[PDB]
Amino acid sequence: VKPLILRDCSVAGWLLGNPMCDPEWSYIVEKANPANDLCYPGNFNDYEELKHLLSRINHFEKIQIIPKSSWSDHEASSGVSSACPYQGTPSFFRNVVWLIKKNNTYPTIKRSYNNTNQEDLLILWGIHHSNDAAEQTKLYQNPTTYISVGTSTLNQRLVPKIATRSKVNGQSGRMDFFWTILKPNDAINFESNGNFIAPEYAYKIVKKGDSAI
Numbered sequence: 474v475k476p477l478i479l480r481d482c483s484v485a486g487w488l489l490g491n492p493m494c495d496p497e498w499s500y501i502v503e504k505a506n507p508a509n510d511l512c513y514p515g516n517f518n519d520y521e522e523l524k525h526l527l528s529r530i531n532h533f534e535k536i537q538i539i540p541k542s543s544w545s546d547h548e549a550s551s552g553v554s555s556a557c558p559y560q561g562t563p564s565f566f567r568n569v570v571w572l573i574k575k576n577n578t579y580p581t582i583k584r585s586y587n588n589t590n591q592e593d594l595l596i597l598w599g600i601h602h603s604n605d606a607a608e609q610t611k612l613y614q615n616p617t618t619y620i621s622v623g624t625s626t627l628n629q630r631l632v633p634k635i636a637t638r639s640k641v642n643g644q645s646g647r648m649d650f651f652w653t654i655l656k657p658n659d660a661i662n663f664e665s666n667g668n669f670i671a672p673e674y675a676y677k678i679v680k681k682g683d684s685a686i
């Protein structure tokens with residue numbers, strides 16, 4: 474088990490799986506000025522807090538918590554962007570899922586994940602802010618949407634801000650990302666009818682000082 478030494482990628486970029494960045498590690502090292510952060514424009518919530526938390530971790534393990542194959546009623550591989558290319562073609566963050574309507578329908582999602590592991594889990598998700606009613610319809614069908622997220626300590630409801638915006642890295646849309654630490658035997662619960670960038674992979678983390686000798 475070796476340290477994870479990020480070359481061209483930020484902490485946020487690696488966690489989310491920025492495709493422009495070329496299973497188990499100890500601590501993480503991030504360079505001073507990584508070229509690749511968030512390829513798609515937007516915000517990473519409480520980023521300073523996450524970086525400090527992650528600097529205190531010396532065991533990481535990436536686990537699949539919501540398999541991409543489990544989205545039977547939503548497209549899970551159709552959402553890509555020229556902001557996030559791979560080998561010259563539009564791509565997307567690899568560790569979260571851009572869910573898109575399927576057959577002109579976006580059923581309301583209810584998904585829970587229960588932390589059956591012995592370690593704390595870092596889980597990330599996001600929201601896509603669309604540019605106008607037409608784009609909203611095209612991608613998600615439903616005009617008025619939300620993402621609700623709950624744990625034993627988190628109670629969040631995200632609502633897209635649908636508005637015309639300047640193009641940043643070619644995109645008028647924005648994506649904001651959020652995270653939490655899910656304690657053992659706690660569960661995270663999602664309900665959404667659109668604009669949801671869903672977790673696929675999460676990270677088991679152990680703080681320095683918490684391991685057996």
Ligand SMILES: *[C@@H]1O[C@H](CO)[C@@H](O)[C@H](O)[C@H]1NC(C)=O
Nearest residue numbers: 545546574575576577578579
């Ligand atoms: C798509 O939705 C329509 C409307 O309900 C339905 O009639 C049709 O069978 C659906 N097609 C597929 C392939 O699910």
Ligand SMILES: *[C@@H]1O[C@H](CO)[C@@H](O)[C@H](O)[C@H]1NC(C)=O
Nearest residue numbers: 587588589625658659660661
């Ligand atoms: C997680 O699963 C365990 C085992 O089934 C259960 O006892 C516990 O209530 C679940 N946690 C939550 C928050 O539902």
